[PDB]
């Protein structure tokens, strides 16, 4: 996995690659690693998928009650804090690692949360197995008060470093853009690995496999 | 860090028709050192006819001595002011040691006293409380040589009644030999002679090295 | 959690909750037990014959184990609870001791369940009396009665519930040592019809022998009620 | 390993308003074969098939929990559960047991009765879903199933061509696996019918 | 204190449940109307003085994105149920990754009401709810009472002006109302029983439509009030 | 039998709630809060009947945290119990969410604490009205707005432009209603709102006030903290009112 | 696997057999322990494994079934329910504090119509179980070190239509093969048969 | 009855629940014990409620342990609970210290449990005479619902109590024989019973200092005492 | 506070549990419910309240799980209730959960008498322990099991239960038992049993024509067994027939409200 985030003049860009693996085999080429937290807060996840899914869901549910209760917009700091309390309690047994990004009344906010429960708010971050490669694009290319376009080009380039150099990351770039007013997912923003040799179609004429026994059931 | 220390030394007792004699050395050993040459915790009086005598870890013998001392106070309050006999305390003690089956007292103990007929007895225990009543007993660092010697002189099984005095001399001789050869046993011995009249005590010097 | 003290003494050594539990037993349908040589007979009155009631009626005589039955009088729902505890107890005992529980033992278990309900904060007493009968493994019958206070006691024959005292008086005269199986049934039916109106289908009846039990049918029970309705005209 | 103690493999593929799910028939204790007539498929309702592999005591116990919860769902809700809720539910139960897991790996295959859209899920043993559009598989010959399906599967297929793809896959993969085999059972599901087929295979 | 406060009286009545019901009937009027494509619920929110801030008084509540409610009777008791309801919806999401159907949510509210009629040391909730939502089976309007009994309705009203409100809805309700003419009817029914002039600041309105529940802002609701 | 516990009367009324409301006037004190353009002010009676009491120890105003203040009206020690639970609530909220509790949400939690004693039996109700004061941020532009919330023994929570609570509240609330008609409170200066509040007290109590007789707290856009207003700044308001 | 058990189902019966041996390390304590425990009038279970888990386990089954029969007027429970009950308890113990019962079981029953209303298919059923809670209906099955030898003979010789006499011969040969090839001595077998008329010991099989 | 609680004190410092429980014991059968120097003797009225009861089963004399026995009066089912705690304590003693429980300790132990109410809803409506031999010779102790226990040279409890304590302040001297107590026992049972007195209708037990064992008298041996009268 | 305790679980001076008795009165006030045992199944019929134009349906995806008065408990057991509605829902959850636990454990359907006992034990528990009111419900259970065939049960507030061939709870239950008593017979078809139920409701509601909108009927019967999936379960065995609980709609009550009005005019 390679997840990345940056802050730009009016908001946050999150990025991710799309390969999920079991062992050394690709189980799913087009898996979605950018998760909803709230209308104005998203999360990208690395670490153990089950743990990353359970904690994000849980905190997204608890943020939703809190908005019904208060009648106010969720603050990114509130998410960060519910996340860290939960991971702290479990002493890294719940091994979620997260990039969290959002925008609230205090402006853009971007932070990492490690599995032992430590947080770091920073203007650019990476996590996951391709974090190193990615992070080398970010330090050569980040600057202050980037425009939306520059931010998107930097995040995509950072993910592509993961895709081509880390074996546990692959396939394409997904971005998410978060601004005061909207959140915009962009699945397959960059598809640097399309097909070349169009697949040979291999056909089995029906009745190729010997059946001993058949039953039918009308629905 | 272990919860266990062996502070060393030796106890020994001998019974006869109306007395028992009980001895324990006064060294308290540390690791390659000596804390003191004058510890008297090995022997502890429970009633006027009953003693507890212990070796092993000293902090454990101090706990066991207190737990016994309060079970015995409770018996008295629940029993019209009477004290339990030696046979009862010995059964009480076994019961209590067993109960720490799972984290045991590091102690080799003896309950020593007069029986109900006026005669001596000694109960030697293992750390979890199996015992029997016997005419003599010993435990601790030097016990694997004091014990065949007492087997020899008192039972005489490979050959063809003692006074208090002859018995006190045999024990004095047995501790003297223990101190010569067992490096963890030494300094003095405290001896208590138990009769119906009461309790006589006598210190007795041993090698200091 | 509710912890109120329900069963308490009042100004002359009366426990009213226990008394009123025993009132509830007096209103309940009549039950009878009769100990023969080698058979125990439990006989109970059923509510009333209806066209609608189910021919296969529910049983009001319960099995506690292969060799021990119970009949009761009083609150039928309380009794079902009591019978549950007793079935558990017998099986618990097999598991702890391999052998099958003795009747006399099972009776003290039940009676102590009743006694505790007279002293346990939070709870009222059961409103039930029981008649419990069974054999040893040496083949000798026993019949016990238990009451709401928790007091148990053994009998040669016994009645509980409504018209307890009347049936019991009839039975004090007429009882006989070493009655046969058929005599015991006869005598039990007779005893019942001192309280009850008719004897068509308002009687169920168990014959508990050593190594057998029978919930008598309606053919064999009609036969005996007519042998006994013929004797009551003399 | 414990997930391979009992043997077995399962595979599910999607087509166009249809799926197929297949399992092998072997039950074992490591290399000793106990039965050759234990298919691993469970029909939840007209729309949902469940495959379970992993340790057989936990397959047996976890499918009974699924059945129990489904029955209560149907009485409370007065309807059949949809493929996606059933999978979210399954996931929740696996993760309830996160520090002491059920050693099962489920393969769920479903079809929305209205829209005719096919939902596939596979789960790890603590319930992380993997929901692609082509196929899913699990059990002792999952490595060898991957490449069979990558090379035979194609978008669009209808019930009869999807069935051959999915039977050739399972057979060729079970034949390089010592702990799965003895032929297979396949369910083929459309909005309108559910066909089952017992496929012949090798007797080793 | 762990003894029950709600008990049977000789004729089989449970009077604490009838007094609670009495209190739910003395509350300010609220009503609901189910159209062919949405639902609308509405309520009076009059303040006692103009020193109170009108905008903060809530009578209609969002429970989740697809469902809302309103009440009559004892406000503070209503908050307990709103909180429980809101939690049960999120709980259902975590488990099944879809919105809790309105029928299920209403059986959860019911069983909470029913708890407080048998449990030791508690009185019953003194409020009735209208619940309005949309799920895979369509659009729903339910009423729940202090007893824990619920009914589905096409149109109804609870609170002090409710026999008249219900009479008036019998006449004007049709099975082929559109959602905009259901809002109209809702407002028109409130207007009849209402003491004083009815404004966008002393009335509150919610609306299910396109599978989504939403309160009207004051400004949206001023639009619909100048038309009637 | 309904007069002694949390059960409904036959008219659906709760008697212990109504009597808890009487506890509020029984205490003999009047409080006025008022929200102006940039601030929120609270003006309570400081009665020191006894010549020997240390007057800086008698107070109705308390901080719940840096940014939220309360004024207790009614049975005083029931007040302080709620101040302690409010403080505990505020502190738990901050540890759980990592930001200080908003005053609107605080007030709702204290209301829920009251409601629960109206519905369970065996715990007396607190015979107070808690008025909470503080600044709340809007989500849109991030501006800070003054609030006033009151919670009462029934568990009711509402927001106000101004409100009198306590003995003679009826007479004082009417005086504020009259003076609302001239200009909305949210358009007033601190000084102008103060003259209204102070004269509400003087009207109702039937007296003339010195600065020692009132204690006053204040949250403002300039300084969000809840803070007592020093006696000099209140003499300048009372002087302004004796004149005009 | 020091104790071999064997079972197979034929058209109108199940034969079950288990080795008598009880051992303390290498010492034979006795060779006549009956391990084929009758659970009810038409059920038996052959358990393999230590005395203690084995006894505690089958006593717990017996008592819970006995309790189900009085809370139900003596109605006989189906074989497939007894197996389902056994399985839930093996599985439960496996995730419990005290841990698994280390017993391996073969449950054999013959199901017989309760009443006239009863539509039940009437006949013999065999279930294999393991100490983990695996459970599977089977036409024959075994446990212990002798299991593999016997399973293959039965794959070779077992048919469904064996007569009672042929099935005793086959059971006898399976016991001889265990004696001939397993180093642990399983010298004496007790063998019982489950039929429509109930459980009965088979004396000619030793 | 529920107007005042289980704990309430009277204006003269009695606890109501305990007064009423003592009244309960008065409506009991009669039972008694007599201490000689050689032995200690206990006896009771049985009082069956008909001739269909097997009389064995209605014992008011129970062995606590080989050297001590009880006779109860008041609510029999409540006594079963006390007599069980006492059997268990007597055996815990022997377990822990390998000797017989003293009789006084046993009475002390049975009284602790009497007053555990506020937990149990009410006192026990029961009094016990415990009788046995330890080292202090034959002893007879009596416990009551207050949890007081007390040693007696001879006592009775029950309906015939107050009448048996005027056959005591006459005929009872400290210095009697086995025989004279076994006869004085039956003299008092005849007096305060309602029935005619028979060998089936009463129970007698002794613990003699000679052997230190409780013995329960046959009906053969109770004939011999009615005879001597 | 102990002086304001009502003492719900305390006997009164005659061996009578007043709260058990008053809760039974509450059931007598409730809508009529009738059960009839026939040879081909059990029939449950219930009167409903008066039909307001403004009522609506829940519009549930499956129609044979719950009407206004009939509930499925499991596929071989259904019921009808009289008394406090919310009390009924708490107990019906209890019963659904117990029936499904039994399937979980024995993988076989719970016997209807066993189910009934668990239900009644739950009720008895609030009569002895716990300082709170009892459940104010009475049930009629219709059941099929292989031990006993079709079975109809009634459960009363005491935690008592009894079997019947026909029964009636609620409002006019004496008038109703009078009629069933006369006209029940041990040879009924399920279609006649339905008719007889409708007549008995027609004579207790007090109308000449049977309003089909004031009636609910449910039947516990057997139907031919569905698919045998011998490939997914080679040791599965299903019987020819299985029980079903069915909540008859208006389109099935048309030829049966017609045959109850030709038996109403010819009388």
I179 phi/psi in degrees, rounded to 5 = -80, -40
Distance from CA of E86 to the nearest CA of D (A): 19
User: Among C73, C33, C79, which residue's Cα sits nearest to residue C207?
Assistant: C33
How many of the other CB atoms lie within 10 Å of CB of H27?
A: 15
> Which residues in C lie closer than 8 A to residue I161 (C-beta atoms)?
58
Which subunits count as partners of chain E given 3+ CB pairs below 8 Å? A, C, D, F, I
Among candidates A61, A68, A69 on the partner chain, residue whose Cβ is nearest the Cβ of E94: A61
Distance from CA of B25 to the nearest CA of H (A): 30
Alpha-carbon span H203 to A202, nearest angstrom: 103
A1: annotated active-site residue: yes
> Which residues in A lie closer than 8 A to residue F142 (C-beta atoms)?
105-106
Alpha-carbon span H166 to H180, nearest angstrom: 17
Alpha-carbon span D189 to D23, nearest angstrom: 15
User: Among D128, D124, D168, D119, which residue's Cα sits nearest to residue D145?
Assistant: D168
Q: Flag if A57 and E63 touch (Cβ within 8 Å).
A: no
Give the residue from C75, C79, C113 with the most I CB atoms within 10 Å of its CB, the best one to mutate: C75
For residue D17, what are the β-bridge partners? Answer: none
> How many helical (H) and strand (E) elements, i.e. helices and strands, does chain I have?
7, 10
How many of the other CB atoms lie within 10 Å of CB of I222?
A: 18
Give chain E's contact residues with A (Cβ, < 8 Å): 62-64, 83, 86-87, 90-91, 93-94
Q: Could you tell me if H222 and H202 are in contact, meaning their C-beta atoms sit under 8 angstroms apart? A: yes
Overall resolution, Å: 2.3
Distance from CA of E219 to the nearest CA of A (A): 18
Distance from CA of A90 to the nearest CA of I (A): 33
Q: At what angle do helices D83-96 and A49-70 cross, to 10 degrees?
A: 110
The four Cα atoms B97, B100, B104, B109 give a dihedral, to 10 degrees, of -10
Distance from CA of A58 to the nearest CA of I (A): 28
For chain B, give the longest Cα–Cα distance: 53
How many of the other CB atoms lie within 10 Å of CB of F104?
A: 18
Distance from CA of E106 to the nearest CA of D (A): 12
C with E: how many residue pairs have Cβ under 8 Å apart? 6
Check if I232 contacts A (Cβ < 8 Å). no
> Which residues in E lie closer than 8 A to residue I59 (C-beta atoms)?
137-138, 140
**Beta strand spans in chain H (E):** 31-35, 39-45, 61-65, 68-74, 126-134, 137-143, 149-151, 154-157, 202-208, 215-216
> Which residues in C lie closer than 8 A to residue I151 (C-beta atoms)?
54
The four Cα atoms F168, F172, F174, F178 give a dihedral, to 10 degrees, of 160
How many of the other CB atoms lie within 10 Å of CB of G206?
A: 14
Alpha-carbon span E170 to I51, nearest angstrom: 13
Which tokens belong to G116?
């006239």
D26 phi/psi in degrees, rounded to 5 = -80, 130
Check if A85 contacts F (Cβ < 8 Å). yes
Check if C12 contacts E (Cβ < 8 Å). no
CA of I228: which chain D residue's CA is closest?
D196
Q: Flag if H96 and B95 touch (Cβ within 8 Å).
A: yes
Enumerate the H helices of B40-85 as residue ranges: 58-78
Q: What is the DSSP string of D64-78?
A: HHHHHHHHHHHHHHS
CA F135-F138-F141 angle, to 5 degrees, is 125
Alpha-carbon span G105 to G89, nearest angstrom: 12
Alpha-carbon span G35 to G22, nearest angstrom: 10
Which subunits count as partners of chain C given 3+ CB pairs below 8 Å? E, G, H, I
CA of G73: which chain C residue's CA is closest?
C63
Among candidates C2, C20, C75 on the partner chain, residue whose Cβ is nearest the Cβ of I131: C2
Q: Flag if I230 and A217 touch (Cβ within 8 Å).
A: no
Among candidates G59, G64, G70 on the partner chain, residue whose Cβ is nearest the Cβ of C63: G70
Q: Flag if F158 and E53 touch (Cβ within 8 Å).
A: yes
Alpha-carbon span F131 to F83, nearest angstrom: 11
Enumerate the H helices of chain F as residue ranges: 15-26, 76-97, 103-119, 169-180, 190-205, 231-243
Which tokens belong to I222?
């057997």
Alpha-carbon span I176 to I197, nearest angstrom: 10
Alpha-carbon span A82 to A56, nearest angstrom: 10
Distant-in-sequence contacts of H89-98, Cβ < 8 A, 24+ apart = H90/H64, H90/H65, H91/H65, H95/B95, H96/B91, H96/B92, H96/B95, H97/B75, H97/B84, H97/B88, H97/B89, H97/B91, H97/B92, H98/B87, H98/B88, H98/B91
Which subunits count as partners of chain A given 3+ CB pairs below 8 Å? D, E, F, I
Q: Could you tell me if H223 and H199 are in contact, meaning their C-beta atoms sit under 8 angstroms apart? A: yes
Distance from CA of A21 to the nearest CA of D (A): 9
For residue C130, what are the β-bridge partners? Answer: C72, C146
How many of the other CB atoms lie within 10 Å of CB of G99?
A: 10
Which tokens belong to A69?
């209760």
Q: Flag if H98 and B79 touch (Cβ within 8 Å).
A: no
Which tokens belong to H146?
């207050």
Alpha-carbon span F182 to F177, nearest angstrom: 10
Q: Could you tell me if E145 and E78 are in contact, meaning their C-beta atoms sit under 8 angstroms apart? A: no
Strand ranges across the sheet with B188-194? B136-140, B10-16, B19-25, B188-194, B199-205
Residue F64's Cβ-count burial label (10 Å; 0-12, 13-18, 19+) is: buried
CA of E136: which chain D residue's CA is closest?
D79
Q: Flag if I146 and G85 touch (Cβ within 8 Å).
A: no
> Are chains D and I touching, using the cut-off of 8 Å on CB pairs and a minimum of 3 such pairs?
yes
Alpha-carbon span E39 to E70, nearest angstrom: 13
For residue H9, what are the β-bridge partners? Answer: H15
Q: H/E element holding I198?
A: helix I190-205
> Which residues in C lie closer than 8 A to residue H121 (C-beta atoms)?
5-8, 119-121
CA of I58: which chain D residue's CA is closest?
D78
Distance from CA of H207 to the nearest CA of B (A): 21
Q: Could you tell me if D11 and D166 are in contact, meaning their C-beta atoms sit under 8 angstroms apart? A: yes
E73 phi/psi in degrees, rounded to 5 = 115, -125
Check if H75 contacts C (Cβ < 8 Å). yes
Check if E8 contacts C (Cβ < 8 Å). no
Which tokens belong to H75?
């609510």
> Which residues in B lie closer than 8 A to residue H99 (C-beta atoms)?
85, 87-88
Q: Flag if I1 and F121 touch (Cβ within 8 Å).
A: yes
C225 phi/psi in degrees, rounded to 5 = -70, -30
Q: At what angle do helices H103-114 and H76-97 cross, to 10 degrees?
A: 130
Question: Which residues 168-197 of F are in CB contact (within 8 Å) with E?
Answer: 173, 176-177, 180
Alpha-carbon span C188 to C35, nearest angstrom: 10
How many of the other CB atoms lie within 10 Å of CB of D202?
A: 10
Structure-token match 């509930």, residue found: I71
Q: Could you tell me if F12 and E20 are in contact, meaning their C-beta atoms sit under 8 angstroms apart? A: yes
Alpha-carbon span A176 to A189, nearest angstrom: 10
Catalytic pick among A1, A2, A56, A119: A1
Sign of CA dihedral E43, E48, E53, E56: negative
Among candidates H51, H75, H123 on the partner chain, residue whose Cβ is nearest the Cβ of C172: H51
Q: Flag if H102 and B75 touch (Cβ within 8 Å).
A: no
Among candidates D39, D42, D72 on the partner chain, residue whose Cβ is nearest the Cβ of I100: D72
């Amino acid at each position: 996995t390679t997840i990345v985030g940056v802050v730009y003049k009016e908001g946050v860009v999150l990025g991710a690659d799309t390969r999920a693996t079991e062992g050394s085999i690709v189980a799913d080429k087009r898996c979605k690693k950018i998760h909803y937290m709230a209308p104005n807060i998203m999360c990208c996840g690395a670490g153990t998928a089950a743990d990353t899914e359970a904690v994000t869901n849980m905190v997204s549910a608890n943020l939703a009650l809190h908005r019904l209760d208060t009648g106010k917009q969720s603050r990114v700091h509130e998410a960060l804090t519910m996340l860290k309390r939960h991971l702290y309690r479990y002493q890294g047994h719940v091994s979620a690692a997260l990039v969290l990004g959002g925008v609230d009344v205090e402006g853009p906010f971007l932070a990492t949360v490690a599995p032992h429960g430590s947080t770091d708010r920073l203007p650019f971050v990476s996590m996951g197995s391709g974090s190193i490669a990615a992070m080398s694009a970010l330090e050569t290319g980040y600057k202050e008060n980037m425009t939306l376009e520059e931010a998107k080009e930097l995040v995509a380039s950072a993910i592509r470093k993961g895709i081509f150099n880390d074996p546990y990351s692959g396939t394409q770039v997904d971005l998410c853009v978060i601004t005061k007013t909207k959140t915009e997912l962009l699945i397959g923003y960059d598809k640097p690995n399309e097909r070349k040799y169009p697949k040979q179609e291999i056909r089995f004429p029906p009745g190729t496999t010997p059946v001993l026994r058949e039953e039918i059931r009308r629905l | 860090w272990s919860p266990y220390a062996d502070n060393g030394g030796t106890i020994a007792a001998i019974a006869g028709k109306n007395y028992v004699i009980l001895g324990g050395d006064t060294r308290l050993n540390g690791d390659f050192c000596i804390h003191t040459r004058d510890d008297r915790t090995k022997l502890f009086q429970l009633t006027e006819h009953t003693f507890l005598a212990s070796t092993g870890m000293q902090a454990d013998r101090l706990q066991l001595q207190q737990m016994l001392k309060y079970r015995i106070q409770w018996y008295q309050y629940n029993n019209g002011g009477k004290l339990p006999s030696t046979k009862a305390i010995a059964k009480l003690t076994s019961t209590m040691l067993y109960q720490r089956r799972f984290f045991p007292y590091y102690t080799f103990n003896m309950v020593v006293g007069l029986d109900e007929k006026g005669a001596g007895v000694c109960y030697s225990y293992d750390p979890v409380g199996s015992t029997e009543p016997f005419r003599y007993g010993t435990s601790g660092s030097a016990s694997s040589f004091v014990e065949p010697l007492m087997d020899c002189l008192l039972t005489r099984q490979h050959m063809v009644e003692l006074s208090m005095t002859e018995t006190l001399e045999m024990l004095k001789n047995a501790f003297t030999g223990a101190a010569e050869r067992d490096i963890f046993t030494g300094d003095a011995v405290c001896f208590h002679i138990i009769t119906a009249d009461g309790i006589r005590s006598e210190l007795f010097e041993l090698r200091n090295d | 959690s509710y912890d109120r003290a329900i069963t308490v003494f009042s100004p002359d050594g009366h426990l009213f909750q226990v008394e009123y539990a025993q009132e509830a037993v007096r209103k309940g349908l009549c039950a009878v037990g009769v100990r023969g040589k080698d058979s125990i007979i439990f006989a109970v009155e059923k509510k009333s014959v209806q066209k609608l009631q189910d021919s296969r009626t529910i049983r009001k005589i319960y099995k506690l184990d292969e060799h021990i039955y119970l009949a009761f009088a009083g609150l039928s729902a309380d009794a079902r609870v009591l019978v549950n505890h007793a079935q558990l107890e017998c099986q618990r005992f097999r598991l702890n001791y391999e052998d099958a529980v003795d009747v006399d033992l099972l009776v003290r278990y039940v009676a102590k369940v009743q006694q505790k309900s007279t002293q346990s904060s939070g709870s009222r007493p059961y409103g039930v009396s029981t008649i419990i009968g069974g054999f040893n493994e040496n083949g000798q019958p026993h019949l016990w009665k238990t009451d709401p206070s928790g007091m148990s006691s053994a009998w040669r024959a016994v009645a509980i519930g409504r018209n307890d005292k009347t049936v019991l008086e009839f039975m004090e005269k007429s009882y006989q040592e070493n009655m046969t199986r058929d005599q015991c049934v006869h005598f039990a039916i007779k005893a019942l019809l001192e309280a009850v109106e008719s004897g068509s289908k308002n009687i169920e009846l168990v014959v508990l022998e050593n190594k057998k039990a029978l919930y008598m049918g309606d053919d064999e029970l009609r036969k005996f009620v007519v042998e006994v309705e013929k004797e009551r005209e003399e | 390993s414990i997930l391979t103690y009992s043997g077995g493999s399962c595979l599910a593929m999607a087509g166009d308003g249809c799926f197929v799910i297949v399992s092998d028939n072997r039950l074992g204790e490591q290399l000793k074969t106990i039965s050759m007539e234990v298919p691993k498929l469970h029909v939840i309702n007209e729309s949902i098939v469940l495959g379970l592999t992993g340790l057989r005591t936990d397959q047996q116990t976890f499918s009974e929990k699924v059945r129990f919860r489904n029955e209560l769902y149907k009485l409370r809700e007065e309807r059949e559960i949809g493929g996606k809720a059933f999978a979210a539910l399954v996931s929740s139960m696996l993760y309830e047991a996160r520090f002491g897991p059920w050693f099962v790996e489920p393969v769920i295959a479903s079809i929305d009765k209205r829209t005719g859209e096919v939902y596939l899920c596979a789960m790890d043993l603590i319930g992380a879903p993997c929901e692609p559009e082509d196929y899913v598989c699990a059990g002792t010959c999952a490595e060898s199933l991957h490449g069979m399906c990558e090379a035979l599967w194609r978008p669009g297929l209808g019930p009869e061509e999807l069935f051959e793809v999915a039977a050739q896959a399972m057979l060729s993969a079970c034949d390089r696996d010592s702990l799965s085999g003895y032929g297979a059972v396949a369910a083929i599901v459309t909005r309108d019918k559910m066909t089952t087929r017992l496929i012949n295979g090798r007797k080793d | 204190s762990a003894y029950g406060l709600t008990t049977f009286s000789p004729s089989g009545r449970l009077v604490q449940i009838e007094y609670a019901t009495t209190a739910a009937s003395k509350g300010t009027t609220a009503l609901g109307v189910k159209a062919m494509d949405g639902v609308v619920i509405a309520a009076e929110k009059k303040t006692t003085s103009p020193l109170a801030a009108s905008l903060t008084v809530q009578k209609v509540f969002v429970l989740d994105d697809h469902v809302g409610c309103t009440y009559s009777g004892i406000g503070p008791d209503c908050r307990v149920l709103v909180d429980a309801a809101r939690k049960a919806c999120q709980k259902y999401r975590l488990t099944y990754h879809e919105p809790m159907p309105v029928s299920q949510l209403v059986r959860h509210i019911s069983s909470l009401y029913q708890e407080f009629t048998q449990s030791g040391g508690v009185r019953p909730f003194g409020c009735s709810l209208l619940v309005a939502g949309a799920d895979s089976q369509g659009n729903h309007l339910y009423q729940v009472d202090p007893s824990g009994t619920f009914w589905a309705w096409k149109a109804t009203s609870i609170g002090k002006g409710s026999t008249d409100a219900k009479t008036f809805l019998e006449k004007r309700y049709t099975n082929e109302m559109e959602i905009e003419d259901a809002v109209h009817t809702a407002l028109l029914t409130l207007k009849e029983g209402f003491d004083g002039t009815m404004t966008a600041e002393n009335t509150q309105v919610g609306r299910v439509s396109e599978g989504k529940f939403e309160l009207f802002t004051v400004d949206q609701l001023k639009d619909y009030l100048d038309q009637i | 039998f309904d007069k002694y516990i949390t059960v409904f009367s036959p008219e659906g009324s709760l008697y212990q709630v109504e009597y808890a409301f009487k506890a509020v006037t029984y205490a003999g004190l009047l409080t006025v809060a008022i929200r102006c353009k940039d601030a929120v002010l609270v003006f309570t009676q400081h009665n020191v009947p006894d010549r020997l009491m240390r007057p800086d120890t008698i107070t109705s105003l308390h901080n719940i945290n840096k940014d939220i203040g309360t004024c207790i009206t009614g049975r005083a020690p029931d007040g302080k119990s709620l101040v302690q639970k409010a403080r505990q609530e505020a502190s738990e909220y901050k540890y759980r969410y990592g930001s200080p509790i908003p005053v609107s949400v605080l007030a709702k939690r204290v209301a829920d604490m009251a409601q629960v004693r109206t519905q369970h039996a065996g715990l007396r109700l607190m015979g107070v009205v808690m008025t909470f004061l503080g600044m709340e941020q809007n989500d849109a532009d991030g501006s800070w707005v003054p609030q006033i919330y009151c919670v009462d023994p029934a568990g009711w929570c509402g927001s106000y432009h101004a409100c009198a609570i306590g003995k003679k509240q009826i007479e004082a609330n009417a005086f504020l209603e009259k003076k609302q008609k001239n200009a909305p409170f949210h358009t007033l200066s601190q000084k102008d709102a103060a003259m209204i509040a102070l004269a509400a007290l003087q009207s109702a109590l039937g007296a003339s006030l010195k600065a020692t007789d009132v204690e006053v707290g204040r949250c403002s856009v300039e300084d969000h903290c809840f803070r007592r207003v020093p006696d000099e700044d209140v003499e300048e308001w009372l002087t302004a009112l004796a004149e005009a | 696997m020091s104790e071999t058990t064997i079972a197979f189902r034929c058209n109108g019966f199940v034969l079950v057999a288990a080795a008598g041996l009880n051992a303390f390390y290498y010492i034979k304590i006795m060779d006549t322990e009956d391990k084929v425990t009758q659970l009810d009038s038409h059920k038996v279970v052959a358990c393999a494994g230590e005395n203690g888990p084995r006894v505690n386990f089958v006593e717990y089954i017996k008592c819970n079934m006995a309790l189900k029969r009085m809370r139900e007027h003596g109605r006989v429970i189906r074989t497939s329910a007894a197996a389902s009950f056994m399985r839930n308890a093996l599985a439960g113990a496996l995730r419990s504090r005290d841990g698994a019962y280390l017993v391996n079981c073969l449950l054999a029953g013959y199901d017989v119509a309760a009443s006239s209303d009863d539509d039940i298919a009437t006949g013999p059923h065999l279930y294999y179980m393991d100490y983990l809670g695996t459970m599977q209906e089977v036409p024959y099955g075994c446990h212990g070190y002798g299991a593999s030898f016997v399973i293959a003979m039965l794959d070779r010789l077992w048919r469904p239509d064996l007569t009672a006499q042929e099935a005793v011969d086959l059971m006898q040969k399976c016991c001889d093969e265990v004696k001939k090839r397993v180093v642990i001595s399983n010298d004496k077998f007790i063998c019982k048969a489950v039929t429509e008329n109930g459980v009965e010991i088979v004396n000619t099989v030793s | 009855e529920y107007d005042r609680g289980v704990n309430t004190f009277s204006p003269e410092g009695r606890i109501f629940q305990i007064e009423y429980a003592i009244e309960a014991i008065k409506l009991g059968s009669t039972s008694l014990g007599i201490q000689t120097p050689d032995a200690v003797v206990i006896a009771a009225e049985k009082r069956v409620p008909s001739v269909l009861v097997d009389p064995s089963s209605m014992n008011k004399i129970l062995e606590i342990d080989y050297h001590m026995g009880t006779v109860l009066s008041g609510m029999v089912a409540d006594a079963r609970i006390l007599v069980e705690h006492a059997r268990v304590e007597a055996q815990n003693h022997r377990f822990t210290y390998d000797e017989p429980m003293r009789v006084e300790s046993c009475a002390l132990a049975t009284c602790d449990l009497s007053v555990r109410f506020g937990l149990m809803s009410r006192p026990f409506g029961v009094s016990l005479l415990i009788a046995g031999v330890d080292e202090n010779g034959p002893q007879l102790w009596q416990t009551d619902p207050s949890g007081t226990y007390t040693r007696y040279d001879a006592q009775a409890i029950g309906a015939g109590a107050e009448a048996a304590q005027t056959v005591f302040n006459e005929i009872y001297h400290r210095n009697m024989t086995v025989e004279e107590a076994e006869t004085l026992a039956v003299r008092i049972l005849k007096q305060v019973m309602e029935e005619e007195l028979t060998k089936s209708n009463i129970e007698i037990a002794i613990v003699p200092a000679s052997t230190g064992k409780l013995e329960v008298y046959d009906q053969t041996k109770i004939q011999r005492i009615i005879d001597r009268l | 506070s102990s002086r304001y305790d009502s003492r719900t679980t305390t006997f009164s001076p005659e061996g009578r549990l007043y709260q058990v008795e008053y809760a039974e009165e509450a059931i007598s006030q409730a809508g009529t419910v009738i059960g009839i045992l026939t040879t081909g199944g059990v029939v449950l019929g219930a009167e409903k309240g008066v039909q307001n134009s403004l009522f609506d349906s829940e519009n549930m995806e499956d129609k044979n799980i719950s009407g206004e008065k009939m509930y499925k408990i499991a596929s071989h057991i259904g019921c009808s209730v009289a008394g406090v509605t919310s009390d009924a829902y708490a107990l019906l959850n209890y019963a659904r959960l117990s029936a499904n636990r039994h399937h979980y454990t024995y993988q076989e359907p719970m016997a209807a008498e066993d189910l009934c006992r668990l239900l009644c034990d739950e009720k008895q528990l609030y009569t002895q322990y716990g300082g709170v009111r009892p459940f104010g419900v009475s049930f009629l259970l219709a059941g099929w099991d292989r031990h006993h065939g079709y079975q109809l049960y009634h459960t009363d507030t005491s935690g008592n239960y009894n079997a019947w061939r026909a029964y009636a709870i609620g409002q006019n239950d004496q008038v109703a038992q009078s009629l069933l008593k006369r006209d029940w017979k041990p040879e009924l078809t399920l279609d006649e049993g339905i008719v007889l139920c409708l007549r008995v409701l027609g004579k207790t509601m007090d109308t000449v024509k049977l309003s089909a909108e004031r009636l609910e009927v449910a039947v516990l019967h057997k139907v031919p067994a569905p698919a045998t999936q011998k490939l997914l379960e080679p040791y599965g065995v299903l019987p020819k027939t299985v029980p079903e609980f069915k909540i008859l709609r208006e389109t099935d009550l048309k030829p049966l409200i017609a045959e109850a009005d030709r038996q109403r005019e010819a009388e």
